[PDB]
Write a protein that binds this ligand. Sequence first.
Ligand SMILES: [Cl-]
Ligand SMILES: [Mg+2]
Ligand SMILES: [Mg+2]
Ligand SMILES: [Mg+2]
Ligand SMILES: [Mg+2]
Ligand SMILES: [Mg+2]
Ligand SMILES: [Mg+2]
Lengths: 226, 196, 195, 244, 241, 250, 231, 204, 243
Amino acid sequence: TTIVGVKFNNGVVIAADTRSTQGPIVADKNCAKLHRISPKIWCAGAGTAADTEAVTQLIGSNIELHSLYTSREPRVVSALQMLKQHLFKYQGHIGAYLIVAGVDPTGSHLFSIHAHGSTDVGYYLSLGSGSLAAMAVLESHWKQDLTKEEAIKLASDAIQAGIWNDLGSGSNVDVCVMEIGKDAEYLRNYLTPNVREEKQKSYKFPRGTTAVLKESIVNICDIQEE
Amino acid sequence: TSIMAVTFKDGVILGADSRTTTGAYIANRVTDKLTRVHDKIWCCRSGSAADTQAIADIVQYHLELYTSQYGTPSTETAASVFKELCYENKDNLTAGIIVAGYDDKNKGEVYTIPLGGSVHKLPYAIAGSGSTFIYGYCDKNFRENMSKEETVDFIKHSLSQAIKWDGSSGGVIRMVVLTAAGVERLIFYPDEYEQL
Amino acid sequence: MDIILGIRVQDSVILASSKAVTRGISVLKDSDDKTRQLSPHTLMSFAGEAGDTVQFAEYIQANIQLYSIREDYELSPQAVSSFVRQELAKSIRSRRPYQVNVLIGGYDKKKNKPELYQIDYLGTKVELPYGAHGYSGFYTFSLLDHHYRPDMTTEEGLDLLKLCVQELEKRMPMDFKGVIVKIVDKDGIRQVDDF
Amino acid sequence: GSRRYDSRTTIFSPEGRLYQVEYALESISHAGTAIGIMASDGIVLAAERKVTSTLLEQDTSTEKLYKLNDKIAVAVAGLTADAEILINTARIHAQNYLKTYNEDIPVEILVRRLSDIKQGYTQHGGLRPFGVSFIYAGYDDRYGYQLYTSNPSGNYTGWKAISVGANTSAAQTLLQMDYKDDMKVDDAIELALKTLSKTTDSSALTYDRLEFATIRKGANDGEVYQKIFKPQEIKDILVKTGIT
Amino acid sequence: GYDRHITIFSPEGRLYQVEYAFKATNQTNINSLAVRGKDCTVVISQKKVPDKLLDPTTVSYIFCISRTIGMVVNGPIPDARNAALRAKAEAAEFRYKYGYDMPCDVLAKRMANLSQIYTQRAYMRPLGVILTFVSVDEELGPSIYKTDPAGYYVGYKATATGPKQQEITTNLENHFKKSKIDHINEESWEKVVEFAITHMIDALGTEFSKNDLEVGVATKDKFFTLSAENIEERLVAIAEQ
Amino acid sequence: MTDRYSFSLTTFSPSGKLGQIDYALTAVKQGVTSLGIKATNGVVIATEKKSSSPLAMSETLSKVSLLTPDIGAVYSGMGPDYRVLVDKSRKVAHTSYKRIYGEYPPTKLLVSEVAKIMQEATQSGGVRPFGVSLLIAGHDEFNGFSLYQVDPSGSYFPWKATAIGKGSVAAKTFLEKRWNDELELEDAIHIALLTLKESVEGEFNGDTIELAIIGDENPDLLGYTGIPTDKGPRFRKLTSQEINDRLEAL
Amino acid sequence: NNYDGDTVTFSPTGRLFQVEYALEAIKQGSVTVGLRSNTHAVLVALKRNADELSSYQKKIIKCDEHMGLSLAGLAPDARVLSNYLRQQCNYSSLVFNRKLAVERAGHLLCDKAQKNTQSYGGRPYGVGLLIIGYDKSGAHLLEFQPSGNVTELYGTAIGARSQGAKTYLERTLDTFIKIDGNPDELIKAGVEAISQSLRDESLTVDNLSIAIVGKDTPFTIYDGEAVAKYI
Amino acid sequence: SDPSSINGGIVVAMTGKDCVAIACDLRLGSQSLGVSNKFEKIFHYGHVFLGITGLATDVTTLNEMFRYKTNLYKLKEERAIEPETFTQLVSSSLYERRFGPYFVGPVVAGINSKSGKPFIAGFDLIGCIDEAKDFIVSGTASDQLFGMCESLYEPNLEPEDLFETISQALLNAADRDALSGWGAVVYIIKKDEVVKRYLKMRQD
Amino acid sequence: TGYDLSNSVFSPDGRNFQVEYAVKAVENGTTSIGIKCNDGVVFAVEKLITSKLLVPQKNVKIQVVDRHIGCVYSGLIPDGRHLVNRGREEAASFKKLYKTPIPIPAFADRLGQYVQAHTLYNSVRPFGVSTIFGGVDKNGAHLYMLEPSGSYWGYKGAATGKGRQSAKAELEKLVDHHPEGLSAREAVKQAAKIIYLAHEDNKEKDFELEISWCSLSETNGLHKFVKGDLLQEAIDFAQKEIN
Ligand SMILES: [Cl-]
Ligand SMILES: [Mg+2]
Ligand SMILES: [Mg+2]
Ligand SMILES: [Mg+2]
Ligand SMILES: [Mg+2]
Ligand SMILES: [Mg+2]
Ligand SMILES: [Mg+2]
């Protein structure tokens, strides 16, 4: 997994690759790692995939109830505080490593969280097995006062470094841009640089190739009238 | 990590490097290890980042609730709350915290709370992995009732050496000055302190 | 308490269970009956860790007898086996699981059919024409796979069972002191006193 | 202290009656009449909704007839909210049994369980009893088609035909008069509607004031089907039997 | 007639214990007033020290709940302090859990919810107090939110509480009917306090010395109470025009 | 201490009446009028913002509340009781449904959960019933648009249109004459405003009336773009201006 | 009247009637006397029988080697309170290697009784106690009331007709306080004190109960022919 | 020792044109010992199909659990659960046992009754959802199945062509796995008809 | 009616009659006072000698909390002890967590909240005591008085019990005649006089005087009992003033 976050002029952008693995095997080639905590607070997760999804949903659910209770739009520091206290309590057993980003009435924010519950602040961050490849790119090209276009470019380039150089990362680049005073724009499959080439042969079989012992209709309908 | 707090004539100054590592990888090179638990009571954190953040947040909560009921807490009181958390949960914590604060009655004070959760009031304190390399330097160069400028130089020179020898320390040198005049943040970059 | 076999023939279920009990390096008993009647037409044999086997078996027996009295009705072999499976599945994630494998031989009076269920200590249930636990199947299944028919008489089932025991007695390192054999059919449960 | 305000819901009267159970039964006597009739080839459940409105959305409405599982249904008389608490508990019990034994729960076992829950509220806890009477219509392979009733006391009994709610004295007499053992479902449907039509406190019995259900082996071959009647279907059966 | 002793419905659908808790609210015979400026929220309350043996510095019905939120109470001091302690604990817990300062309106809702529970649960009695929360909220700006023993709460442009609340309320109503704005159009909080005191003098028809009043002021990032000498300076400015 | 009221405070009287429920219904009767009307392509719920004082900012008091993105609620009776029920209803929609099935509950089932909570306050120890009747409007994929009433007993009924509180008897008669199964949402809003004017004494405008609809999906209120299946909330609260515009065509 | 249904209710004049009714149970109880000098402390108790076939109810209970009491009122309540004193004396010895001060024992009994007067469901204790002991500050005598009030005294009496013995001790105050190093004379003064509370009946061999504790004297109870010497 | 490979077995699911297919082997074993050749691993609740591989006791327990839950769902909702909704329910149910999990590899297959859209999904033992467009694999021969599916699969196959593809994917994967085989079943699922076919295969 | 039969019930007035009945028990008790001086506080109490058999100076009424706070009360003595036991637990937990000894205003609220809690439920009875307490902390001397309702304020001088009116009048004279303040030693003398003057309301039986004090200069900010020569000196001063 390669995930990054990059601050810019009027907001923040996060990005991620789309490969999920079980050991050396690729389970899903187009996985969605950019999760929504709230409309304008998004996070990307590395580590145990179920934990990153579950902890995001739980805090997202409680954030929504909090927003309704307080009649205010949710803040990134609230999501951060709730995530870290949940993860700390479970002493690293919930293997969620997240980059949390968003905009709220206070402004634009970017944080990272470790599974044991420690958090960090930064203008550019990277997490996952491809984080070193991504950080190399970020450390080479990041500057202060980036534009929206420059940040998206930098973020996706950092994910690409992970895609090509880290075996734990691959396939496509997903992006989400969160700008102040605007709707968050989720760009699913922003880049697609790994389409499989056409195969040399068609492996469609002639009908009747497989040997069959018995056939029967399966009753999926309920008990019938009359 | 290299952290220290030093009392001087007008109050106290906290100092820290900005490097956090996961093994040999620098996970953050611009960390802020100088943490506010009250207006003029700050702390330097070392050990588990998760633990020391969790502790500091709980202390900040306790001192906020204390203030609402009983007014401004003393630095000793803040150190006591830190100690209670560190001592009672010693089996499940890896935290080395230095507490520094300014009262008008007591002026600048420094308390160090090592791994076991004991408390030690000192004129100055050093902690973190990099502190080992500057026990000699700091003992030879510390004086009581130094000026602000002298104390800044002492901390700058001390943490410079700690950074020079300790791989787990590095980045920028952050400092927080606590006096009657208020709270001042200072930052010193590698090109400045490496040539000392 | 290691060998238990079962075979479902035309009109009955036959359970064969070893008689030996060993404490340390000494065989304490050579006439132990590793079985409990759960209901008039349902028999359960068992094997596993010492103590747990009888305790679990008697606990199941008590529960089925309680159900029988409450409803004035005998549960079907399938219903009993499902109850037993759930108790073992429950038990495997307990603080200290009950290390017990069972065979349930019952005659369903409603369907007029014999039924044999094999359940291990994890709660792994299967309905089979013949079954075993532990290593018993390694020696006996090749004979059962060869000779077994679903239209076998009780007498033919006993003869095939004798062949299985003879093969066990030949190739198995331990001495299990023969087997007690019991038959479950429409008339209930009876023991074959000469085997 | 608190004792001062305690009504003591679980005590005998000098005559040996349970005050709250008796008063709960008084409440139920004002509820819409529900009728159950058992035939050889199925069971009928018929019930009257209480003084409705033209603006009530009937096709999505349910206040009388509830499904417990595929084989068992109940007709309600009393506080609807109290009934739903018990209904959901019964639904869970049925699934617990199915999970445990891998067989559908026998009707009586479900009935006994709910009736025991009602009983508990009359003997301990100091809480008011459930102001509900149920008619249980169900099928299993032991006793076949069965009708039961339970009331706030937690007592339950089996029936060939039975009514609960308002005008049960009049309704039970009418059922006792026309009921026969060799009766069929289509005949039982007619008897139920005719009895409600005579006992109702309303001016006339119409489709919008009724809930109707049947449990039939009129399901293709050896199996049972539950039919909760739609508003249009209740309107049709009213015309067929010659009430409207 | 035990429906009057605990919080259950009377035949009229009323809760008499709640109604009687409202009456306890005026037991202190103190009136309070709250108004909003451009950058601030001011709350003033009458101060009466009837006993010469009392330490007047400890006689107070204004509370500093958090750094941003202040609270004035109308009702007996034991219930007032009960509410004050709980509000302080709630505000501190909120900041710890959610990472930002508890808003004035959110605290008011929370305390209102707690009060609602006392009107529904029999074992708990209502607190005989009305709580007026004030702040300069970072999102909503100057804020006044008031809670009562029924568990009711609402935001206010301005508000008044006490035995003579109606006289003060009408006086404030008439001023805002003229100005046609939802606040006191004034830059400094000092002049907003002067407005508040002046209009209480007009409404009640009584003059005040420095020891007859108690003043709380909310600005951005802090709530504070004025000393007697700060109030005296305020009274001098009022008299000089 | 300890809650020593472990016994029921609502009990059957000799006549079979549950007194506390009846008295809770009486409190609802005294409450301000609120109504709901169901159209073919939406539902409308409305009530009067009876301001306790002109110095009070009545915009800060929300009588019409969002429960889920597709479900809204209004009440008549005791406001504080309503407020806490809204808090519980919002939470139960998550804990007993969304955290299990990954989607918001259908209207009828959320109503069922709220009803259960109100039923329990009628039987559990040491509590009185809630002094409110709720009108809950909503939409879900398989049931379409719906409108439900929930009473202090916990009983709930589905309505085509109805009214509760002060002038409910007159309002329900007014709705019976105007309602048909071919109404469009704008027609229902018009009828809602007409019906509500009869029970209002003083000022009748966008600032004194609270009105919300369950209608089309609002992608402009979602807060993000990029997921086609997510099209926005069906619940929308009408503004003061939007109400006044429809009061000119009244 | 309307305010005596439970211990949690004050009357309009600020009285606690259930506590007062518990106090009444002590007045119905048999008389017991307590008195001390500077070296010894003595308890004297008139035991009561049910009839001529019955035994005489024991009145004096040992709490430790250096402490014990006599009772008047509900005997089972004295057993509960004396058991508590035995435990507290024992806790002090086991944890602190320290004999429990008589004054501290009184404070503990006060607090235990108090909790039963302020809470719902419970009832006050229906017994009065006279505690004697010898500790590091010499001889002591305490009077316990189930209201919670504990009082240190030179001498006292509780139970039916206790006023007669109390007046006698008030006259004899200057004499019996000076009886140092003479246990027999101190007991005599106690037997003479309790005699001022007798009517119709007199002190017999199975009627009289005496206890003593002092400088070099463990708490010991005398019954039967051991008190014939004093009759 | 490894709970996910004691009993053995495999499940595979595939999408086609207006159809889905789900298939499984029939083996249950105790490590090397083959115990049953009739242990079906695919179940259905209404029109939603669930295949489960892994520890057999958990396979049976979870089937009984999801029958339990889908029956209550239907009684309350007054409609059959859809594949998308059921997928979330499986995920939620697995994650609730985060630190004491069922040792299984579930696979959901079905067609949404309202939209008509084919749907498949896979899970790890603790609930993480894999919602693939093409195919899902599970069990002790998942590596083999990935290899077969990746080469044999093409989008928009007709029901009877999809049958041949999924059957050959299962069979040849199972014949390279010691702990899979002993028979096989294939479900071909269309919006309102489902056909079940038992395959002939080698019995070693 | 019936509103006075149960604690925590509001009467139609908005009153808690059970708390008002608890005040009657306080008014029935012996006189106790408190005097705030220049650098500390003085406490004094009237102890009625019911009989000659009472051992002099043994039945101590004034209680210490921590080492810097004194507490005295009038009314039901056991209730007062219960409140002081709680106060001691509160002071211990404060010092345990925060290190510094509990400030007097902080301590006052701890007692206040606990007493107020006994007016919230019908399952408990209100406290039948008014408690006068205080001491020296980092901000100087503090004197408080706490009622059965939970109500408390800071005081220059305080009095409760049967002779409270007499005592209050005497305290008011001291406040007027000494705006600059009163010394600790003067306050002890004045405290003795006031208890002697207040004893006219309890003139049937004779009494024993008990005094305690906390002073920054005289006791190093610790609570101590006035004993021996200093007590006798105060008794003599008091006896001289009544004659
Ligand atoms: Cl809340
Ligand atoms: Mg840790
Ligand atoms: Mg370095
Ligand atoms: Mg098995
Ligand atoms: Mg209440
Ligand atoms: Mg194979
Ligand atoms: Mg093989």
